[PDB]
Amino acid sequence: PPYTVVYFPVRGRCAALRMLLADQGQSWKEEVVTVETWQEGSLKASCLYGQLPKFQDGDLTLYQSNTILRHLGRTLGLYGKDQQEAALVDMVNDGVEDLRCKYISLIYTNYEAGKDDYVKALPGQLKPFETLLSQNQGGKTFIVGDQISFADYNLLDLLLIHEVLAPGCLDAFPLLSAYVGRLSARPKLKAFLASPEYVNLPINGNGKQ
Amino acid sequence: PPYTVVYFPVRGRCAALRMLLADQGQSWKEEVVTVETWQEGSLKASCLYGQLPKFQDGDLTLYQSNTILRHLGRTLGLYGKDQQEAALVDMVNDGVEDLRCKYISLIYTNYEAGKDDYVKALPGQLKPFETLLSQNQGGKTFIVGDQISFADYNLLDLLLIHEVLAPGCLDAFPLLSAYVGRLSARPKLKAFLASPEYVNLPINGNGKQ
């Protein structure tokens, strides 16, 4: 601590981490990089991998958003309670990553044309999480075990951006809905999701949503 | 333990955990799934994300390559020695994933037309790892401190498939070429990189490399 997030002013790949932090009583600083600024060359060359986010936890400066989330699960204890659960929250976040990366392909490289087949192909892609909840206590808790993890935060968001893509896709998936409902009902998250801070910050930055 | 790897007759995405368990003196049963068995549908409906590798470590069946790699790191002590070392081995294995994702899209989507353009972007893609290496003992040891990590194996698999695709790439990356020269040497691994079950396997299946 203190936490400092540097990203472009989109919800993007840091919505999961922002939701984590605010739910887990933590504060953070936002340092915004606009596209004009990014274009002025320096910071992209400072960034290890040319991209964003950049997290600063104290003296540690992290990159790759999944790394950032794993790191806050080790540190804050959002990573299972044993090594089986740990393996499974890995299994599940890499599930959300694979889909998230496909979403990104639509939103930036084929939205208008591809959006079509995307919401058709979606049920088979959201299928595994529906399975996962039924095995984990019949979905009345969390995707891995019975304590929130950093994987509950990255799945809940992937779910939320898709309910915006398709107002209603989660209805085919009744346990997936029960989950989002329950998790947006956790107070610190609820207060966050309803904030100016969250609401007027675009999901993808290019207009598509 | 014991370890069972369930995959197609190709190195591909099990190459790195096979290098890991071989270098660390472990042994595993390879369960070989032919395209004929994948085609006859029963295995797919068992795998949680419809795909393979599938890995059994005793009572755990785990899906997804980097989750297995991350598991063996947690279990066989190969995820660095302290909190900073772990977020950095994850930050490196992530950086690696991003470039493996682009290599499999080159290989199973459009090799022929996409290659020249791929090999054009490669120096800019390998350059982060040279850097990481220079930051630590001038790249005299490993990619994250004193001792080997899962992220060291997986990165080594990427540069070996990349030297088959673009022979001459690593020659400008001397630390990175020496890194391969020194981790290939460690004779438990070196015995494996000349075994039948490694030399007699296709990199990619599709016939491209």
Ligand SMILES: CCCCCCSC[C@H](NC(=O)CC[C@H](N)C(=O)O)C(=O)NCC(=O)O
């Ligand atoms: C203005 C709106 C842009 C919307 C996308 C913002 S994120 C774009 C990109 N970053 C990434 O790709 C982040 C991915 C990285 N692997 C991670 O997991 O953290 C990135 O920083 N790209 C900039 C670049 O490569 O030049």
Ligand SMILES: CCCCCCSC[C@H](NC(=O)CC[C@H](N)C(=O)O)C(=O)NCC(=O)O
């Ligand atoms: C049958 C074609 C010849 C074999 C080529 C190698 S197949 C490897 C491929 N696996 C993946 O894409 C799994 C990816 C998963 N994210 C992981 O962490 O590893 C995969 O399983 N896909 C095959 C499929 O979906 O049928």
